[PDB]
Amino acid sequence: DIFSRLDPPEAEVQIDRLITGRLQSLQTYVTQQLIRAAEIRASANLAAT
Amino acid sequence: DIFSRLDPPEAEVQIDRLITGRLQSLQTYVTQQLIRAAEIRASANLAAT
């Protein structure tokens, strides 16, 4: 929709903002999966023991 | 300050920069609390044992 109603010079800025925001979303997601996977791993170690 | 002396269209972009920077600080706080919470739980599991 950005392109449909805006020129490239300004559309690159608007899309870059959305990219940064959604890229931050992925960093939040992956960081939490690593922290939570360490907890299930500690539980799997207890269950194996 | 910003909104009061400047221009609303510009104040909005600068306030969004403050929101983003402060949100990133606050999200960093929460990530480190989850990493530290696992260390306290690991110690508490040893103390219970």
From Swiss-Prot, chains A, B:
Q: What does this protein do?
A: Subunit of the fusion protein that is processed upon entry into the host cell. Mediates fusion of the virion and cellular membranes by functioning as a class I viral fusion protein. Contains a viral fusion peptide that is unmasked after S2 cleavage. This cleavage can occur at the cell membrane by host TMPRSS2 or during endocytosis by host CSTL. In either case, this triggers an extensive and irreversible conformational change that leads to fusion of the viral envelope with the cellular cytoplasmic membrane, releasing viral genomic RNA into the host cell cytoplasm.
Q: What is this protein called?
A: Spike protein S2'
**Entire-sequence positions represented here:** 979 to 1027 of 1273
